[PDB]
Ligand binder design. Structure first.
Ligand SMILES: *Cc1c(COP(=O)(O)O)cnc(C)c1O
Ligand SMILES: *Cc1c(COP(=O)(O)O)cnc(C)c1O
Lengths: 523, 523, 55, 54
């Protein structure tokens, strides 16, 4: 049948917000979430409300408060912390003050006030790009989880945005407005990638040409040298990539990372790299292209999956202080610079000094509104708390818990399918590939496996499952329609449901085997 | 001296986030805030965290939770409410369930779950435009505070956005992408208005022509018929207006509202009205242009000032089900419709049916990302709580408290300036006009008043104050430089500070009077 | 006392004056069960509890 | 501290040392901050809406 037609139909046999999200946005919404940093947030909120009431000078029963005062805040916070040792979030808050004060060396009072004033949401974000201390806390978390083990923290700047969704919207419009990406420009895209990232560059607002950098199934979905080398083409202005990938769900290996490193150093020092690494924490020793080529990369990191915070809309765009986007802006034609000089005039005197990452902020809200732009303060505070939570968990227990949960769901799913496929060191598996050829092969041998692959189709497979379980899987994309296969997220369902997907597929395979047995036995 | 030059200088003699906000964004950040709905929010958060932990099936000390279950939620919420009657926010939550259940007639379980799942921020907003029940709660609040006492609630749709700041950015880009506003188009602007709203239409992204609709000082800053009539010009595609106004801070009277009503009904049924009414709740019996011409108006309402929530970034764009923006989209050239048919193809089959307010959503995040667009769920939940708070306060006590606070600050400011100017029925006074002519006139008579106005200048006045108090006021704009005058917000400072502005200005006036006395006495 | 509480949950507006609404029959058993369990040390409540069973 | 703009610690100390009644009134005419608080009440209740506090 057809791909962009099978999606429309599937949404029918099985309707659900989850199934629609998977089909409409190619995302698996996590059914788990970090609770400790959230309780810490709500508890910090009860402390901040008390701080606000201490500042309202008149008598009322209405419920009005003033701005929290920074003076003596460490004392009052410590009183609050001591008086509520038996509440989880509270213990967390208290330790987080120590982490910021003792391990990061920041001003403790400043920290508490930013969080307090922050969570009350009674002041416009300042600076608009990101709250001062929250920016330093979050980048510490970013640098660590991206495996950017060589980039000094002071060199990374962050722009807080409402998720990777806002991030991409911002980045594409800014690149276009600053003439760093013009129509007809070639944008290399790591493939396969989910639908959304294929349609923006296809928009008429941009009109970009796509150069596919196809992953190779026989290489466990890594990018082969020959494919990565396609970047040496000087006509390719930007490398758009999701890593760990979606849907293959694997992280680029060392080979692939070094490959790109060389390509940038010896052939393309002008190449712009745009990488979405939301799944990084689900991989084992993840390293981002941002860690490898910091000055050629705009890193888009979302807090959505790891923290089970898709609803909080929390993300950051990271850029190295010295980067190719500012250089390209420097190299624009005087003609163009004058034009930009008039766009960001109301911002600063020397518009030519205005950094790219800051134009992102300016651009996000029609420039003239730059001073009331930025992510809400309560969201930034929750973002910093999520960050502290991961940074303070030295033993990575939360991370181990989630990887163990993923694997438990995988074990349940492949119970009647011949056990889960062999794991690699690049395996992430937030999404898992259910390939009819591999399953039948494990169950009844290579011979049957080959016959089956010709008798069935992805449509057949997905329909059979959607029918018997109500779950709609993602068609397997990336390797010539010659292989019936679908994808499931191990992050959005419960055990018995995976158990049902498997049971449904084992039935399907036994049916094919019965047919195959009856046929060969007619020789 | 100069206006766009005096701003740059003032930011020097006195530096502060408050002074910068007033100068850079023409806004007075409230030093007050609604505490009850915020405590209610944090308390709802502790309840939701418990609901989440009830859904995690394994043993850990890490702090992981699952999705809250809707079944039996009314029972558990009621247990929570009964067990915490002594906490303010809790009492509020409980009553809010009744308001939604008994006065709005919505599903109680649905309500609780939306709030619970909402505050946990573990799911993508759905629908992207706005959470179902939050949309019905907030529009009830909007319709009431806008004085839209004749528009059935079912006819108003809302799009939750991150403040009026995001709203305007969205609306201008959407109008341009859908060809409802093209370059060279005439946009009428209610003046005076703060700087930000003057620079967007001036952007090269848009390139619009401004037709000023000047308010008349002698009319207490209302718009005279002759000025409003300038809208009959068929070349004026959109009327851009802030009401209650900033900086004059008055609400359009009945005359002005009816005037525009007729202009739309008998001459311009195709005119698009874009109104920002954030200050509405500070006026007495406010009525929005949206209440008067619902089908010709896109209402932008912010929760920032009234709730002292500038940091939460909460706002909504309201549109009537049947409106001129969709009609104009219907009237576009087939040529154009085909072009749009390809922009929003991935959204729906019959793109021509896609309503304008929904294109706002689609446009906000590059279309392809429409399904993960929308305001974060926790913000929407806080927005609904703020709304319920105002709706449940039948006696408008919170509102009276804030109007009384405003007036107290005004009384303190004009103590040594001859008492505050006479109040009108259209007076809002979130910002107050300190006019040297009126003050001197009240203090030493009309004669002196006239001599003084020629001896001084706005620069002089603002510098004298900035010097002696550290507070930088807003130059008085709107009536020919012939009148030294500045503006202060009665919402961002404390009593003793207003007391100091006044003391500084009385000194200045006495000095002018001493000179004037010495002169005339030489006849 | 339990009814007083029930009525108060039905008043949808904010006031300190002390006005209640009509008790709702939905979910009444659970709310009553909570009230019984929280006041096992009050004679009257133990009796109320038994009454529900008898009926 | 917020509306009158006086020193909070000084205020608290005057009230605490004051109510303990362990020090002679100083200065004799009236305690420094009490005078400023009370005069703001006086001016207001006597309708002296134009007289400067100081
Ligand atoms: C799930 C997902 C995200 C999350 O989008 P947010 O707007 O950040 O919630 C980002 N990128 C990819 C590839 C995803 O799978
Ligand atoms: C203060 C103000 C607002 C608030 O902007 P938000 O982005 O909604 O915080 C809106 N419009 C005007 C005219 C203002 O004065």
């Amino acid at each position: 049948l057809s791909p962009f037609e099978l999606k429309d139909e599937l949404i029918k046999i099985a309707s659900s917000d989850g199934n629609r999200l998977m089909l409409n946005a190619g995302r698996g919404n996590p059914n788990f979430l970090a609770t400790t940093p959230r309780r810490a947030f709500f508890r910090l909120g009860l402390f901040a409300a008390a701080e606000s009431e201490l500042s309202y000078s008149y008598m009322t029963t209405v419920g009005v408060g003033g701005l929290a005062k920074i003076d003596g805040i460490e004392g009052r916070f410590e009183r609050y912390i001591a008086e509520n040792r038996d509440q989880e979030g509270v213990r967390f808050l208290g330790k987080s003050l120590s982490y910021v004060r003792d391990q990061l060396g920041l001003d403790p009072a400043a920290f508490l006030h930013e969080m307090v004033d922050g969570i009350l949401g009674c002041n416009y974000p300042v600076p608009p790009r990101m709250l001062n201390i929250s920016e330093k806390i979050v980048r510490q978390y970013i640098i660590r989880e991206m495996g950017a083990d060589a980039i000094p923290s002071e060199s990374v700047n962050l722009f807080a945005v409402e998720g990777g969704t806002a991030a991409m919207a911002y980045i594409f419009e800014s690149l276009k407005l600053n003439g760093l990406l013009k129509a007809g420009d070639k944008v290399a895209i790591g493939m396969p990638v989910f639908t959304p990232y294929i349609e923006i560059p296809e928009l008429a607002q941009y009109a970009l040409e796509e150069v596919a950098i196809n992953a190779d199934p026989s290489l466990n979905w890594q990018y082969p040298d020959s494919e990565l080398d396609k970047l040496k083409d000087p006509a390719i202005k930007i490398f758009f990539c999701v890593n760990p990938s979606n849907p293959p769900s694997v992280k680029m290996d060392q080979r692939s990372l070094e490959r790109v490193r060389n390509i940038v150093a010896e052939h393309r020092p002008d190449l712009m790299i745009l990488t979405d690494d939301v799944y990084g924490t689900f991989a084992d020793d993840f390293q981002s292209l941002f860690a490898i080529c910091p000055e050629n990369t705009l890193l888009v990191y979302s807090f959505s999956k790891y923290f089970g915070a898709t609803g909080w809309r929390l993300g950051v765009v990271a850029a190295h202080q010295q980067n190719v986007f500012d250089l390209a802006l420097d190299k624009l034609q005087e003609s163009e610079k004058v034009a930009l000089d008039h766009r960001y005039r109301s911002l600063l005197p020397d518009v030519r000094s205005l950094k790219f990452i800051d134009r992102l902020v300016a651009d996000s809200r029609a420039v003239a509104l730059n001073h009331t732009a930025g992510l809400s303060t309560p969201q930034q505070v929750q973002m910093a708390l999520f960050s502290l939570f991961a940074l303070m968990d030295e033993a990575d227990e939360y991370k181990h818990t989630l990887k163990q949960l993923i694997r438990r769901r995988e074990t349940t799913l492949y119970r009647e399918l011949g056990m889960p496929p062999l794991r690699d060191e690049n395996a992430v598996d937030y999404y898992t590939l259910i390939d009819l050829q591999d399953v039948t092969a494990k169950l009844y041998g290579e011979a049957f496996s080959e016959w089956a692959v010709k008798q069935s189709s992805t449509g057949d497979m997905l329909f059979r499952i959607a029918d018997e379980t109500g779950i709609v899987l993602l068609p397997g994309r990336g390797f010539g329609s010659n292989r019936p296969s679908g994808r499931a997220s191990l992050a959005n369902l419960n055990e018995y449901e995976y158990a049902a997907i498997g049971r449904a597929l084992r039935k399907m395979a036994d049916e094919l085997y019965a047919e195959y047995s009856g046929q060969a036995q007619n020789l």
